[PDB]
Amino acid sequence: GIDKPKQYKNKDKRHPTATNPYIRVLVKIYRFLARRVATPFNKAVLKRLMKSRMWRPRISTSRIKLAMRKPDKKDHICVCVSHVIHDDRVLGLKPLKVCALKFSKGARAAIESAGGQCLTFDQLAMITPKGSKCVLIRGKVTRRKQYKSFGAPGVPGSHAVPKLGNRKSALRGRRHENARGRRKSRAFKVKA
Amino acid sequence: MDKYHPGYFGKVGIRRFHYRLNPRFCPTTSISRLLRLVPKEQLEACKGKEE
Amino acid sequence: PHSWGKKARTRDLFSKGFRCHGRPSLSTYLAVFKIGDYVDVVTDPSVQKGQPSKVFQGKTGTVWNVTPRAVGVLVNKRVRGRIVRKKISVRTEHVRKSRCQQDFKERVRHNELVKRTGVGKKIKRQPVGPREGQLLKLRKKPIPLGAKKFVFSEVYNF
Amino acid sequence: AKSKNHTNHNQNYKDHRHPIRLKGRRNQISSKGLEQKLKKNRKKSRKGFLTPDVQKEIREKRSKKGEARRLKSYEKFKAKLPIWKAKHKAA
Amino acid sequence: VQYPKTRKTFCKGEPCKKHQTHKVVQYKVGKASVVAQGKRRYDMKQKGFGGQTKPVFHKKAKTTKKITLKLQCTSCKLIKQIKIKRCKHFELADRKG
Amino acid sequence: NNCFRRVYHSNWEYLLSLEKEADAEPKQKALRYKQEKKQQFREKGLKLAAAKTA
Amino acid sequence: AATVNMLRVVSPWITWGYPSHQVVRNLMYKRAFAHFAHKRLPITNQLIEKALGKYKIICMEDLIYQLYTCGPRFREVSKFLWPFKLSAPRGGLKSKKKHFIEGGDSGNREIYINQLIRKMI
RNA sequence: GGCUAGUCUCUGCAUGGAACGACCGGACCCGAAGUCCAGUGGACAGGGUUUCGAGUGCUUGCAAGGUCCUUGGGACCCGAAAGGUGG
RNA sequence: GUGAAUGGGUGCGGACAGGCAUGCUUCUUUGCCACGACAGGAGGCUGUGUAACAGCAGUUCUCCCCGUCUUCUGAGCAUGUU
RNA sequence: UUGAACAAUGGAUCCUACGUGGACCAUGACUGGUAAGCAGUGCUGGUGAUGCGGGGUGCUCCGAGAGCAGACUUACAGAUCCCGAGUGCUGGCUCAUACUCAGAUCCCACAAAGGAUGUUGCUUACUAGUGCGCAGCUCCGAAAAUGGAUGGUGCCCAAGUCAGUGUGUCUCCCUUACAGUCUGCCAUCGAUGU
RNA sequence: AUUGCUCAGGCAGAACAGAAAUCUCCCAGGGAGGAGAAGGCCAAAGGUGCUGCUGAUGCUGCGACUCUCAGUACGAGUCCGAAACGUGCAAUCGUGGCCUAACGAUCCUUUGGUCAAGUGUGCGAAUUCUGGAUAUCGAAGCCAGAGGUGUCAGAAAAAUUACCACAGGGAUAACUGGCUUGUGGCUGCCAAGCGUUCAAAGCGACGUCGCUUUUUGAUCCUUCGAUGUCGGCUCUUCCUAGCUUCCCACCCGCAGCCGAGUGG
RNA sequence: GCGUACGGCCAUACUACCGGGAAUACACCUGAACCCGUUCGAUUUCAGAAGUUAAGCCUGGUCAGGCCCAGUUAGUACUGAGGUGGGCGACCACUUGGGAACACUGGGUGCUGUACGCUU
Ligand SMILES: [Zn+2]
């Protein structure tokens, strides 16, 4: 026997959990690209195609606009390995090249009403095989209604949303879980 | 209960007998979501003009 | 010990030294602390105010907050399997400027003055290693070393 | 009936299974608790901060201040240099 | 335990907002109103069959109450209600004794 | 030693020397400014040597 | 100082000693494997050039030289090396439990570790 | 984008931490100066705080299925001495 | 009155270290004007290379001195430079 | 001199389903108790959860840790026979008439004060002899109930006991664990090219 | 809080007055005092006299923390910001006690505040009772205290069962057995004495080393889905710590007798 | 070679006893109209300068007491790790590291910063 160190297990994810055969085709294409072009962009896109669906979150035309707002990205292609949905709050879009896994009808209309293009990842692989002039943006995994509840509300400093199953009080003063440990009146309030 | 549901175990607030909610129903929107609600033909023919 | 007071089991701990009683002198009050400074949290029993807890008795922390008469210090405390960054608000009578970085700062200033003026040899501070071969003329004649006879009297002197 | 209540036996083992580390060591610590005068002064200082371009031209002006003296004396020294070099030759 | 009859302390009242004279009176508990909401609920719950419904207290460990003191500002007549520690006897100090 | 007396004396000498450091810190700051000037000069001399040998 | 104060405290589990030049050579040429690429690879001149060319080390003779006479790059050579696996020695150990001075087989065998390595290769 | 096997600038997603001269609602303090009108004198407004929120800062949603679970249910299976209603 | 062994806290640097110049503040200071006005002299000086210091390069040079004008408080946070 | 050494497939950010919450053992670190296979603690490791070699047998001692095989080598510990490995080699010491046969590897399976002109050594005072002593073995002290237990046999210049020796070298220093080394296969986790 | 002073105790001295009244001088590191238990701390003082005061809740739905700790609360305490104050020439110090103990959740009640009123020498400045309003009617609400849970993270609470029952438990007693043997029982060593003289013929004090399980303890290891719990009778066997018989053993304070002790 | 004011470290500086002290001082010192305070101008406050180093302060001495330092105690005590070491234990020795304390011996008996002076 031997006093072992930890036997290596690779943390990284190397198989698409997606059940869509066309997502699997894209994983095949970008395995090829991350091997025989070997750019950081191609390796990143391969990672993100592997990612489960929680971790390739939806992203808005507002995020596309915020990414491309700088004059440096006049010809760049905004790449999101995600479903792209439209921010109704965004009114005037610039002509933008945007590659994604899916564009909502609204996002596609908003991007093609400004003269932009809605690219699929195979089109991106044939246009920029090295992913040059491609602005990768992800999408935010906080702000989830689960992430807000993560932790404990009764822990001082943790501002976790208490788990309320289906009970949405109508009187916000006589709400559920708002009295003892929520006001110093009731002998203590959870610290901030 | 202390750790996962602080505000349990108490009673706070004015209790309202026969709480009507239809006279309190009030869905709100924002100014950011207004110009989406105008056919942009109007939004274009009214841009600098007075109407 | 069936009494966990704020000063339990501190008879020997919070005792002053032999012929060392009295409140602290003006060198304790003319010290200067800045944020980030390293400080030994060392309780002074002559001042009963602003004292830290006995669990920060020989702990070196770093200053995070400076109040008029006291100073805030961040000391690491192993709880059971974590380390927590305890924040103490301790008056400056119960804390000393820590020389834990004195040798390091001396060495850094030395090396930087070396590489700025062109004199010195930039300490690297290796351990004490094996020695080389010498020929060691050494007039001195060796003394016979060996065991000696046992004498019960010379052992059990009375 | 009568138990053997307290023990600290396997506790170091359990506590050392994973490395005993501080959670946030590089993270900044909150400003809450910092002295109020220093917090107010940080706020007001940052409010008064000039911009990098104004600062650049301020530093430029400060450098240009003592230039007529410096350039003149330096060119005088540079003129007297070759005499020094030719004297150092004779050594 | 003695306590003065008056005491200069800060009156947090709009007219004063400063130190005032503050005459001192002990705090007597008032008669429980029979028409308070909890008393009405307790009556509605007590009436009927079933015996006693809320738990009465029997244990009675304390031998002393905390002393509550109403300091009334001589100017505002605003009452600040303070407390002192657990003391068996208590009387406002007749400062001659 | 490790006596309380020895340790307190070492701390008092530390505070003395920190005070003297702060007392001669302006002079030291002038000297250090001149030293950075000489370091600038050394760096630029090295740069000129490289650019002339290339 | 640093290494000896550790060797002392772990001595009841180790022997150590000062190997001879030929013992070092036999070890290197019969038992040495590279700790490289997170693998245990058999030493070759090309693998030595790849893993240590940075230090002007190209052959196994360089490793043997630094090891025997420490040289500047002893650290890099020793790190490049994988801890030697040695068989259970022929002849055997007198007694694991005592010290070498107590007739046993622990602690410092200043020169009698050549006699041990020779049995273990 | 320059540049060079030294290596500089611009972009800055996600995540974590800090901040806010930011803002929304609540709570304080000094005030209520100032502007205004669908005018019963009413509506906001200013400056300060060791302030709180399950707050916002380019909405992270909905639905279905599946896995491991939770609580109510007989509740993994069997198991009381008992209590009750009617005969 | 001393005081081990074994122990415990902290520190041991970037190629983020260290130094330098400047800014802001309602905080601190007597410490502002001033992000101002004025200013002479001496000099084989400075750096790379060396115990032979030869040689080679000249960058708002070195020193009196980070000068004088009553002479310029720190701290925190930033802007640049190396 | 990138300014201590050594190591390091690692650091950061989270989520989440369970079992457990009777413990016990060992050690001048101890406390209560006369003590206990007693009760309560401390550090660490074990048992529980763990098989394998040895201790005859034994959950905890000593060695070592366990995929299936082949070869070699060893650990602890062993070699009269049972039982693999020398009735080894080299100096001693001890002879025990019992029912505890003298004695016979840790834990451990007991022994004390006291005594001996048995015997072997040594110190020491006295002028070869006489005194004190001190160590090794041996004897007495040494009594329980089914017949019995260095494990059995038995052993006596031992097969008891104390040392030394077996050296890459030895007339005889050899034995062998699931441990070490090499090899093949199985499975796992990876790396690389695909 | 300022400020002055120095304590316990002691030498010496002064009418009554003495050991001990009061006064004076010298000595006194604290042997005093600081409410109390103990510990730490403290001398032109975290002591004490005098005096002045009320900082004994630092305006709030007001902060960061520390002990406890799950890094929860209560509690206790440290450190700040700034209103208004005490003291002081001032720096400062002061939001209780020199420090370590001195205490308390939801719900309910109660009081104060909010509100409402009043002032407002002109303006405001606002919680609710729901079809719209009024009412120092009443009630509710929010905020701060208080009324208590001492089993002190907080049910409202008497016995008995030998008439008994159930689920379990060898986590746990009563019987055997196991470990230990304090106690009990049995032997050792030494030798102060007794023994007519004589330490041992026979004892053996003061001391002290052991053995057994054989009394009672101590424990709680096996057994509570049961090992039939005392004594006696019957019947067998074993031990020796030997009572008789045997060696007519050896020894005596053994002449014989009767005996004492020791050995097999 | 010193004085005074303010100090830092707080006995190598203290305690006792015996001596000496140039100058500047410091100090004792003289009085009570005022400021002020007392049972008492003792302290204290005010106002002074006739006298004195007598004391305070400084300084020299002491195999003084104390304190400090070095040696030495002493590789002694103790101790981390290890053994199928010894021992019935009590405990001891060994291997590998760490390593005091009292006592004893002897020596010593403040250093110094800022400012203003004396000594010139
Ligand atoms: Zn008032």
Short mmCIF file of N, CA and C (backbone and C1' of nucleotides) in Angstrom, two decimals, chain A residues 1-3 5-12 14 35-36 55 147 150-151 163, chain J residues 9-12 14-16 64-66 179-180 188-194:
data_model
loop_
_atom_site.label_atom_id
_atom_site.label_comp_id
_atom_site.label_asym_id
_atom_site.label_seq_id
_atom_site.Cartn_x
_atom_site.Cartn_y
_atom_site.Cartn_z
N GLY A 1 0.80 -1.21 0.00
CA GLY A 1 0.00 0.00 0.00
C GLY A 1 0.83 1.26 0.00
N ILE A 2 0.18 2.39 -0.29
CA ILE A 2 0.84 3.67 -0.42
C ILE A 2 -0.05 4.73 0.21
N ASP A 3 0.56 5.68 0.91
CA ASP A 3 -0.16 6.83 1.44
C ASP A 3 -0.46 7.74 0.26
N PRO A 5 -1.80 10.45 -2.49
CA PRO A 5 -2.47 11.73 -2.72
C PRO A 5 -3.77 11.48 -3.46
N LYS A 6 -4.53 12.56 -3.67
CA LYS A 6 -5.80 12.43 -4.36
C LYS A 6 -5.57 12.05 -5.82
N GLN A 7 -6.18 10.94 -6.24
CA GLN A 7 -6.13 10.53 -7.63
C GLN A 7 -6.92 11.51 -8.48
N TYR A 8 -6.33 11.92 -9.60
CA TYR A 8 -6.89 13.02 -10.37
C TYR A 8 -8.26 12.65 -10.93
N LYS A 9 -9.25 13.49 -10.65
CA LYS A 9 -10.53 13.48 -11.34
C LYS A 9 -10.70 14.85 -11.98
N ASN A 10 -10.87 14.88 -13.29
CA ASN A 10 -11.01 16.16 -13.97
C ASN A 10 -12.33 16.80 -13.59
N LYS A 11 -12.25 18.01 -13.03
CA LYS A 11 -13.46 18.74 -12.67
C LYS A 11 -14.30 19.07 -13.89
N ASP A 12 -13.65 19.45 -14.99
CA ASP A 12 -14.35 20.04 -16.12
C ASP A 12 -15.29 19.03 -16.77
N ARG A 14 -17.08 17.36 -19.98
CA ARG A 14 -16.64 17.03 -21.32
C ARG A 14 -17.65 16.18 -22.08
N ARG A 35 -9.84 21.22 -31.27
CA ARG A 35 -8.66 20.39 -31.48
C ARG A 35 -7.74 20.95 -32.56
N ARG A 36 -8.26 21.14 -33.78
CA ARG A 36 -7.40 21.40 -34.92
C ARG A 36 -7.37 22.86 -35.34
N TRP A 55 -26.77 26.65 -16.88
CA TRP A 55 -25.52 27.37 -17.00
C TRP A 55 -25.28 27.97 -18.37
N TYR A 147 -31.46 30.86 -6.60
CA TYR A 147 -30.26 31.49 -6.05
C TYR A 147 -30.61 32.47 -4.95
N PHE A 150 -31.08 30.32 -1.81
CA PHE A 150 -29.87 29.65 -1.33
C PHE A 150 -29.40 30.21 0.00
N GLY A 151 -29.07 29.34 0.95
CA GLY A 151 -28.62 29.77 2.25
C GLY A 151 -29.70 29.67 3.30
N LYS A 163 -38.15 30.52 1.99
CA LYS A 163 -38.86 29.64 1.08
C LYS A 163 -40.33 29.65 1.45
P U J 9 0.99 17.49 -8.18
"O5'" U J 9 -0.25 17.98 -9.05
"C5'" U J 9 -0.88 19.22 -8.78
"C4'" U J 9 -2.37 19.15 -8.95
"C3'" U J 9 -3.08 17.96 -8.28
"O3'" U J 9 -4.35 18.39 -7.82
"C1'" U J 9 -3.63 18.01 -10.54
P G J 10 -4.90 17.98 -6.37
"O5'" G J 10 -5.08 19.38 -5.64
"C5'" G J 10 -3.95 20.10 -5.20
"C4'" G J 10 -3.91 21.49 -5.79
"C3'" G J 10 -5.09 22.39 -5.49
"O3'" G J 10 -5.07 22.93 -4.18
"C1'" G J 10 -4.54 22.57 -7.76
P G J 11 -6.42 22.96 -3.32
"O5'" G J 11 -6.95 24.45 -3.50
"C5'" G J 11 -6.12 25.54 -3.17
"C4'" G J 11 -6.50 26.78 -3.94
"C3'" G J 11 -7.94 27.25 -3.78
"O3'" G J 11 -8.16 27.96 -2.57
"C1'" G J 11 -7.38 27.26 -6.05
P A J 12 -9.56 27.81 -1.81
"O5'" A J 12 -10.56 28.74 -2.63
"C5'" A J 12 -10.27 30.11 -2.84
"C4'" A J 12 -11.07 30.67 -3.99
"C3'" A J 12 -12.58 30.58 -3.87
"O3'" A J 12 -13.13 31.60 -3.06
"C1'" A J 12 -11.93 29.84 -6.00
P C J 14 -19.91 31.46 -2.43
"O5'" C J 14 -19.99 29.88 -2.56
"C5'" C J 14 -21.13 29.15 -2.12
"C4'" C J 14 -21.97 28.67 -3.27
"C3'" C J 14 -23.00 27.61 -2.93
"O3'" C J 14 -24.14 28.13 -2.28
"C1'" C J 14 -21.87 26.97 -4.89
P C J 15 -24.84 27.26 -1.14
"O5'" C J 15 -25.66 26.16 -1.95
"C5'" C J 15 -26.64 26.56 -2.88
"C4'" C J 15 -26.99 25.45 -3.83
"C3'" C J 15 -27.60 24.21 -3.20
"O3'" C J 15 -28.98 24.35 -2.92
"C1'" C J 15 -25.92 23.57 -4.70
P U J 16 -29.54 23.84 -1.51
"O5'" U J 16 -29.49 22.25 -1.64
"C5'" U J 16 -30.27 21.59 -2.63
"C4'" U J 16 -29.72 20.23 -2.96
"C3'" U J 16 -29.81 19.18 -1.87
"O3'" U J 16 -31.10 18.61 -1.77
"C1'" U J 16 -27.67 19.11 -2.85
P A J 64 5.50 -2.13 9.16
"O5'" A J 64 4.42 -2.62 8.10
"C5'" A J 64 4.79 -3.40 6.98
"C4'" A J 64 3.61 -4.18 6.45
"C3'" A J 64 2.49 -3.36 5.82
"O3'" A J 64 2.75 -2.98 4.48
"C1'" A J 64 1.56 -4.90 7.33
P G J 65 2.54 -1.45 4.04
"O5'" G J 65 0.99 -1.20 4.28
"C5'" G J 65 0.05 -1.41 3.25
"C4'" G J 65 -0.84 -2.59 3.55
"C3'" G J 65 -2.12 -2.67 2.74
"O3'" G J 65 -1.91 -3.30 1.49
"C1'" G J 65 -2.56 -3.08 5.04
P A J 66 -2.75 -2.86 0.20
"O5'" A J 66 -3.78 -4.05 0.00
"C5'" A J 66 -3.37 -5.32 -0.50
"C4'" A J 66 -4.49 -6.32 -0.39
"C3'" A J 66 -5.79 -5.89 -1.06
"O3'" A J 66 -5.86 -6.38 -2.38
"C1'" A J 66 -6.20 -6.59 1.18
P A J 179 0.19 -7.48 -0.51
"O5'" A J 179 0.78 -6.78 0.79
"C5'" A J 179 0.79 -5.37 0.94
"C4'" A J 179 2.09 -4.93 1.55
"C3'" A J 179 3.25 -4.79 0.57
"O3'" A J 179 3.27 -3.53 -0.07
"C1'" A J 179 3.92 -6.14 2.37
P G J 180 3.30 -3.44 -1.67
"O5'" G J 180 4.80 -3.05 -2.00
"C5'" G J 180 5.57 -2.26 -1.10
"C4'" G J 180 7.04 -2.48 -1.33
"C3'" G J 180 7.42 -2.80 -2.76
"O3'" G J 180 7.58 -1.64 -3.55
"C1'" G J 180 8.36 -4.42 -1.36
P U J 188 -14.30 0.31 -16.07
"O5'" U J 188 -13.74 1.32 -14.98
"C5'" U J 188 -14.42 1.49 -13.75
"C4'" U J 188 -13.61 2.29 -12.75
"C3'" U J 188 -13.15 3.66 -13.21
"O3'" U J 188 -14.17 4.64 -13.13
"C1'" U J 188 -11.37 2.54 -12.15
P C J 189 -14.29 5.76 -14.27
"O5'" C J 189 -13.21 6.84 -13.84
"C5'" C J 189 -13.18 7.36 -12.51
"C4'" C J 189 -11.88 8.07 -12.25
"C3'" C J 189 -11.41 8.99 -13.35
"O3'" C J 189 -12.03 10.26 -13.30
"C1'" C J 189 -9.62 7.61 -12.69
P G J 190 -12.12 11.15 -14.63
"O5'" G J 190 -10.68 11.82 -14.72
"C5'" G J 190 -10.03 11.98 -15.97
"C4'" G J 190 -8.54 11.91 -15.81
"C3'" G J 190 -7.73 12.27 -17.05
"O3'" G J 190 -7.61 13.66 -17.21
"C1'" G J 190 -6.87 10.30 -16.08
P A J 191 -7.87 14.33 -18.64
"O5'" A J 191 -6.42 14.34 -19.29
"C5'" A J 191 -5.27 14.58 -18.50
"C4'" A J 191 -4.03 14.18 -19.24
"C3'" A J 191 -4.11 14.31 -20.75
"O3'" A J 191 -3.86 15.62 -21.20
"C1'" A J 191 -3.26 12.19 -20.19
P U J 192 -4.54 16.15 -22.55
"O5'" U J 192 -3.84 15.29 -23.68
"C5'" U J 192 -2.46 15.44 -23.94
"C4'" U J 192 -1.99 14.45 -24.97
"C3'" U J 192 -2.74 14.45 -26.28
"O3'" U J 192 -2.34 15.50 -27.14
"C1'" U J 192 -2.42 12.23 -25.55
P G J 193 -3.41 16.16 -28.13
"O5'" G J 193 -3.53 15.11 -29.32
"C5'" G J 193 -2.39 14.72 -30.06
"C4'" G J 193 -2.67 13.51 -30.91
"C3'" G J 193 -3.90 13.60 -31.80
"O3'" G J 193 -3.67 14.34 -32.98
"C1'" G J 193 -3.83 11.49 -30.73
P U J 194 -4.88 15.10 -33.70
"O5'" U J 194 -5.64 13.94 -34.47
"C5'" U J 194 -7.04 13.73 -34.30
"C4'" U J 194 -7.38 12.27 -34.32
"C3'" U J 194 -8.78 11.91 -34.76
"O3'" U J 194 -8.93 11.90 -36.17
"C1'" U J 194 -8.21 10.68 -32.83
#
